[PDB]
Design a protein around this ligand. Sequence first.
Ligand SMILES: CCCc1cc(C(=O)NCc2ccc(F)cc2)[nH]n1
Length: 148
Amino acid sequence: GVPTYGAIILDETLENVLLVQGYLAKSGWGFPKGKVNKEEAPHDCAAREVFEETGFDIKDYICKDYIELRINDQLARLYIIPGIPKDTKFNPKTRREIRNIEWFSIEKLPCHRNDMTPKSKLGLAPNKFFMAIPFIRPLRDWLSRRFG
Ligand SMILES: CCCc1cc(C(=O)NCc2ccc(F)cc2)[nH]n1
């Protein structure tokens, strides 16, 4: 697949992250991100997707040196943007693609989906944070290294 770029936006306390909820196939909560256009630079795609999806422009706050994961053939890179005040008014451009935009406490998000071992059944229970989950442990580790 085509690389995706976006951001992990944190508040001033570093306890909360900004997630967006789409529709249909993309009905759960995840970090704002999207497909790179041909000839577009990563930092530019990231700002554009985050602007389209949240109304907030990160261009002045991106530091070039993020968390990146190869998930089933596809790279997803989210630039880390700390210190965005919780009272920022976020508004998507395309309300046809984004249902809602909320802050979530990092410490209450799961960093793995639960199994179904009290049902003797294989796989994972559904989780509305499926798309965010793979970034939560790496973000927690990055915040420990960079801060304390
Ligand atoms: C395996 C289930 C597939 C899936 C993918 C997503 C998702 O990405 N939602 C968040 C989101 C929505 C819209 C958007 F523009 C940016 C992020 N949710 N469920």
